[PDB]
Symmetry: none
């Protein structure tokens, strides 16, 4: 049988979204695939933490009752869920420099801008910003109001990438 003896991955607490999301997703899919009940899951929790997360868990052990709130607390204390104005300040900080590919740039900008509350920004508003911030090497060939959707910007960008 076995229940939370060890795992392939463990936790370290390094103040990053990707590591804690990978850890919590691997823990959830292991709990789903093994068949462990919810009552057995919380009691076998302190075998996972090894770094200074375990002296964090030594403090707030009595604060949690069920598996849901105890899993919610791990997202609350280590992932900051930043407010609005810092994210809005962050997008207008770094202009696109030279010798950088357009695709990774728009990829990083979309991953940065996806953290806002949903329903505030459709594809028209999002589409204004990338064209507005590109170098003059891109802005000469493609104008605004030609690229309606979001795929067409990358589509006309790759052709000017090819010729260069």
């Amino acid at each position: 049988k076995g229940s939370f003896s060890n795992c392939t991955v463990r936790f370290s607490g390094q103040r990053d979204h990707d590591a804690v999301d990978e850890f919590i997703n691997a823990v959830e899919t292991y709990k789903e695939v093994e068949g462990i009940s919810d009552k057995d899951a919380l009691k076998g929790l302190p075998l996972l933490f090894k770094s200074i997360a375990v002296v964090w868990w030594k403090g707030v052990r009595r604060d949690a009752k069920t598996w849901s709130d105890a899993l919610q607390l791990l997202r609350d204390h280590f992932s900051p869920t930043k407010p609005s104005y810092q994210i809005y300040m962050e997008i207008f900080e770094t202009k696109q420099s030279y010798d950088e590919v357009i695709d990774s740039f728009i990829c990083k900008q979309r991953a940065l801008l996806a953290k806002l509350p949903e329903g505030r920004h459709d594809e028209e508003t999002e589409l204004d910003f990338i064209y507005g911030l590109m170098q003059p090497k891109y802005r000469e060939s493609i104008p605004r109001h030609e690229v309606k959707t979001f795929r067409e910007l990358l589509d006309r960008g790759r052709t000017v990438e090819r010729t260069r």
Copy 2:
């Protein structure tokens, strides 16, 4: 049995056709073999991403709900179905170098020629380009109009290769 715990293949976002096609082939074969349900396959999908493509998947999580739409969304950004004139200029940008076997050559040529729109070329036209493009080790013993079907070219090539 199984709910997509962990497997061998992984993705990087290299922007080549071969790795992206191999990844989709391996995942779509494993899903049909192991017997994983259609809804349950999507919840285990960000366990495979490891790289710049995690930044990609974080931006378009709200776009796809069905597994087929997520598969087409994975195909659309990386392997973009480049137009015809790039392929036609690419099939003539490389001749056959010496001491190279005919099998890997005809495999790469068919894999590069299969990107065209289907129904635009018969069997005879493809057979013409392959005979003309080969090294003069083969053209002096294999003349045109002997072979018609695409298998007899390899059949008459491997004998001359074995004879050396």
Copy 3:
């Protein structure tokens, strides 16, 4: 069947409080997780001691007849089980220094305070000591009686940390 085959957590007698406390905690959680019965755990005890301590278990084996007395003996012979007065004279012992993240300080304070007997200190009393101990980079803009819940201290400290 199967009880106490092997694991990573082994004990060696290094005369420090942290290592013996982590060992006793890990064994005590493993006993409740795996379901090992009380009377059967005493037989499989020297599979863990592979150190100088296996010489020690040959000397004082006959003093223990139950699992609780054996655990208390293993605590008593190696760890002096520090009382409350040294904890209270050790909490105010050190202050907060410059350029230190507030989360590490709060985690250290709660981890050092959770060893007290449970039920003697509610939430209002614990907060005052941490507020008093805080660095005057934090105490100028965050006064007492504005915070009630323990989360409010971290939530108002992160803004002053970001403001710089």
Copy 4:
């Protein structure tokens, strides 16, 4: 359930007879050991090809409808399935050199001879070729018609090897 999840033996197309023969042998023994049925093995075939060959399987997939024809195609496209006459003109090709252990020579000769069709050569016929190719450090004291069984050659060769 479960059929062809993963293993160490993977195929890459390295154009050498030894690697493809070891791969076909290992897959053929795994099929009989694990109990994978005949019709179900064709679906789980491209989980092994993670190389240039996964491009090759997209080209010629429709030529195979059974497992035997697929195995023959995988043999035919990469390995020229050497006939008997090259084996007989390659066995006498090399002799025995000085300071060589007799066991390695007999193992090489039997491994190179076992690829012949079974039932055409009994035990008396094989002995003649090995005896003829023996290094005259061995042929002076061990003449023909003293040995009958194949073990007698090694058993009388080890004494002359030890005598030095």
Copy 5:
């Protein structure tokens, strides 16, 4: 369940008392825990030997048939029950060095004194020797005739150690 497949502990043949006693203790505890039959334990015994002791076990395989006789044969050659005058000359060849805790000292002294014939020393005779052996950090505050039982010496030592 289990028929002695593989475990953690292993033997080397170091010719010290502690490692040889720890090995026999671990094996005799594992045999009683896992439920391995008396005859079946001997057939899996040369899987544990790794060293010069394999050369030892190859010589005396025909000597033992029962597990108890094989255990005594393993005890007889390595830990040879050295005579009394070596132990009596050894218990006085080492005084107590400074900054050394009393627990490891009394543990090593009892483990070295337990090699004597039992029934040759009462409880009173051991205590005087331990008192004579100790550093003058302890003798000035703990005088003779205060302690009688062997536990009260450690009880009156740990308080002076905590006071420092």
Copy 6:
């Protein structure tokens, strides 16, 4: 379930008794603990060999029918089972040199002399040979006919080892 997919140890064929004995013992205890039948065991045999043992097995595959003869052949071809006169020549070759312990010497001599046919040599002949093969540093203090059994030689040797 599983049956001979892989193992912890595999085979290499390095002309040594200890390696092939360890391999054959691990294979036998794995077959006993897993519950594999005898018919399934021979068919799953060629997954183990990786070195030049596999081209040895490619020759003699048809020579074996059952598991017993196929396991007997592995001891026959790789372990030489030396005859009498070479073993009798080997024991009188190397005299005991200086600064060498008596115990490892008599251990190596017993492991060498145990390979003879059983019943030819009791304990009286062996003691005389051991007395005969030692330096004058040992022969002065202990004479023949004082040490009746075999333990007493080591017993009186360790005392002259101690004083030296």
